[PDB]
Structure formats: structure tokens, C-alpha cells
């Protein structure tokens, strides 16, 4: 039971897909770098703890299509993230824990 989301589409899209991905409370996720760089996956702590979101928040920088980060959803909620930098029109996509 895992969830993965490619950072962009093959064709050449920005928005992440699948926008929404099912996850389990305790499972991990993998965000493979597809394209559209530089860019990152920043997570906000709205309906979730700060520290928590922090971790979930990727303050890195993916450039090459190989370096993929990972996250862990302990609390059964709904984390959200948005590309701050990027070079288009932000991105839409969130996660959900069961």
C-alpha cells in the first residue's frame, strides 16, 4: 500500500498527477521527477500540524529525472502542497489518508 505522483506529465504539463492519490495512515509516498524544473513540493500546514507538515514539506530541489523524495502520512488527514517557484501557474494536487 503506497502512493506515487510524477512531478509533471510526460507530454509536458505542470499540474501534478494524479492530482489526488490514496494513502494509508503510516504509509509513505514517492514523488518521481518527471520534468518542469526547477521545482519542488512544498506542503502547507493548515488542517495539519506544523512540524508534521514541515517534514511533508519538500524544501529541496528536483532537477534531474531520477531524484525522488518521500513522505509519510501518520495522521489520517489531507495534506496539500503548491509549487512556489516553478515557471508557469503553480500546481494543483493533494493527498488523502485512509
UniProtKB/Swiss-Prot annotation:
Its cofactor is Cu(2+). It is found in: Cellular thylakoid membrane. Keywords: Copper, Electron transport, Membrane, Metal-binding, Signal, Thylakoid, Transport. GO terms for molecular function: copper ion binding; electron transfer activity. It is a peripheral membrane protein. Cu cation binds at residues 39, 83, 86, 91. It comes from the Bacteria. Induction: By copper. GO terms for cellular component: plasma membrane-derived thylakoid membrane. The keyword Ribonucleoprotein does not apply. Residues 1-98 form the Plastocyanin-like domain. Participates in electron transfer between P700 and the cytochrome b6-f complex in photosystem I. Belongs to the plastocyanin family. This is Plastocyanin. It comes from Synechocystis sp. (strain ATCC 27184 / PCC 6803 / Kazusa). The chain holds residues 29 to 126 of 126 of the full protein.
Amino acid at each position: 500500500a503506497n502512493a506515487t505522483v510524477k512531478m509533471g506529465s510526460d507530454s509536458g504539463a505542470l499540474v501534478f498527477e494524479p492530482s489526488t492519490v490514496t494513502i494509508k495512515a503510516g504509509e509513505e509516498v514517492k514523488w518521481v521527477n518527471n520534468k518542469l524544473s526547477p521545482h519542488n513540493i512544498v506542503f502547507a500546514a493548515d488542517g495539519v500540524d506544523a512540524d508534521t507538515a514541515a517534514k511533508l514539506s519538500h524544501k529541496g530541489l528536483a532537477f534531474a529525472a531520477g531524484e525522488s523524495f518521500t513522505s509519510t502520512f501518520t495522521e489520517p488527514g489531507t495534506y496539500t502542497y503548491y509549487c512556489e517557484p516553478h515557471r508557469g501557474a503553480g500546481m494543483v494536487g493533494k493527498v488523502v489518508v485512509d
